[PDB]
Predict the structure.
Amino acid sequence: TNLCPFGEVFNATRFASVYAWNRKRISNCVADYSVLYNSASFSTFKCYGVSPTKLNDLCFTNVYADSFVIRGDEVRQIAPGQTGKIADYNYKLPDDFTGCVIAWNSNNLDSKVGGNYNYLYRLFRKSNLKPFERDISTEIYQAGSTPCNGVEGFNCYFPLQSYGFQPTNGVGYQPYRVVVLSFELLHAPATVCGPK
Amino acid sequence: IQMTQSPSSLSASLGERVSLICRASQEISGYLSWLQQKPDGTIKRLIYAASTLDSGVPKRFSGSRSGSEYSLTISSPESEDFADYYCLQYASYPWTFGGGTKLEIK
Amino acid sequence: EVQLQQSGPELVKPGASVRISCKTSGYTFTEYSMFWVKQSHGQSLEWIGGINPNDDSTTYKQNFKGKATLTVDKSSSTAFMELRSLTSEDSAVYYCTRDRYDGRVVDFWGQGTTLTVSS
Ligand SMILES: *[C@@H]1O[C@H](CO)[C@@H](O)[C@H](O)[C@H]1NC(C)=O
């Protein structure tokens, strides 16, 4: 019967950028992950909670679908326990992440002919963010002893700089879309279940 | 913009209390550091922030934001402590310093 | 061990330029900013300016901006100051320093390069 709204996540027009990653709370629906895992479109389908094949057998309280664009070198940082500016200042998974990371080369549309600049990532933050935090804040960065009272100045960086995405870039400087399916069981009864 | 260290030179016996001041014309929001300079070239930080020190600072000499004045005060002199002292205004670029104050035996 | 290894005492006749290095160690070089100070024999110390090496960013005192030039090399992990038009104004003990927001501010310094421009 009714299939979960995966089309509105994986098949959308404009994804979030990694500092401001979108979340959709998939629940009260049947989740046909066989549509996903059989797709020739994906580069990466790393499942950490369970083996990818068994996803159509399981049921969960909710499946949070976290969506964002990152560089083709940075997709790796999305795995749990990874280190690096995406894993530490933008989108962090917990050590026991019970979910799947799915990613595809999206240079087809996320790249503009003279370069695209719409996607921002946080290069700087006073501390690593905690698992599944998101930090929208544009507050000027304190990169120097001098207090950044002025809007801009020495060591008063914008904690967010923009990607360089161009069609002729290498695999690595290309805009990989990522979605992270964080499956979750709680006291609440199970709703999102594979099809029969 | 720079702040003014009250004295140019100050003299003492061993054991005498020593107060060193760097007064302010405009509020630097409590951003300031103290440095000591040997006449033979040795520079090292004493104090930063508001009465805060780190790394290895001789004994426990600390000052305070005395309202419009910034300060250093010490519970003893020492043979090496008899040297030149400076306040730095890292409150805003360009960084500025007080003229320095020299600490001496009588 | 932190050590701002720097260049030894130096002389050139006036109307010229000079090379001054400050090697740094005991930390990852791009995790801290670098600044500079000029202290004369008969005058107090003054802030020349600073080149945070990681972002290749540079700020100066307006007075020295017209005669200083700060640089770094990442592979050498070393700071480098160039001075031009060495006049009767251009002689001091020159000093390198490193900084950050988390408490490590203007703490450790280089030995003190006594640039001399006399003949
Ligand atoms: C995504 O769109 C493609 C378009 O060909 C479709 O074949 C696929 O089933 C869709 N799947 C998801 C996960 O939305």
Summary: Chain B touches chain A through seven residues (CB under 8 Å). Residues A 6-7, 10-11, 35-36 surround 2-acetamido-2-deoxy-beta-D-glucopyranose (CB under 6 Å). Residues 4-105 of chain B form a domain with the Immunoglobulin-like fold (CATH 2.60.40.10). The CA atoms of residues 17 and 29 of chain B lie 27 Å apart.
